[PDB]
Structure 1
Amino acid sequence: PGLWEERPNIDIITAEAMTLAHQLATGEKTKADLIDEGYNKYAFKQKEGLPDWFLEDEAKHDKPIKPITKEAAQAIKEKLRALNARPIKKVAEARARRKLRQAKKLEKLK
């Protein structure tokens, strides 16, 4: 006719980071120990002026190796598990598929 919107968030998605988190949570090594071990050979290494190819070459060949714990791995898997990862329908159909596989194995054995 008539032409409400008004500090960085640190998230651990890495097995080594969750392993260090577990080690800090347990009375295994303390804060002072973490700084002391943080002054290692990888410390004081430049990152600001460097080209992407150089940085990625070092990133792929210079990851320090640390043991991973089963607890840290399970915690990372639980945190990164999808919300629709294990629906009732999918669990039921996986069980049905394995039951069918066993039945077919038995019939082949027959």
Structure 2
Amino acid sequence: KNKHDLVDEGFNRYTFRDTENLPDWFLEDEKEHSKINKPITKEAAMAIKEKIKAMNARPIKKVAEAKARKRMRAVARLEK
């Protein structure tokens, strides 16, 4: 899809709506329920999970702790 194709798709069920004059208790009930369920891909979900992942998500500490968890599990299955 090019720019021209999306400009067509942009005209929804929900276009031509004022948003700045209106009280918040009305818009907070519109915006919850104004989401057109467009088809997704796995290819996109990959990149958006690669975009949100921050720096301290997987340090040395939590890697060593993860192995410290799995060693305890491997011990607990010889306790029987």
CA distance in 2, matches of 1:43, 1:55: 14
Give the match for residue 37 of structure 1. Answer: 9
After superposing on structure 2, the runs of 4+ consecutive aligned residues of structure 1 that deviate more than 6 Å are none
Q: Does 1:96 align with 2:74?
A: no
Give the fraction of aligned pairs with identical amino acids, expressed as a percent: 65
Higher RCO (Cα < 8 Å, 6 or more apart): 1
Distance 2:75 2:15 in 1: 59
Q: Is 2:25 aligned against 1:57?
A: no
* Distance across 2 between alignment mates of 1:83 and 1:69: 26
What corresponds to 2:42 in structure 1?
70
The whole-number CA distance in structure 1 between the counterparts of 2:40 and 2:64 is: 33
Question: What TM-score, normalized to structure 1?
Answer: 0.65
What's the TM-score once normalised by structure 2's chain length? Answer: 0.86
Give the gaps of 5 or more residues in structure 1.
Answer: 1-28
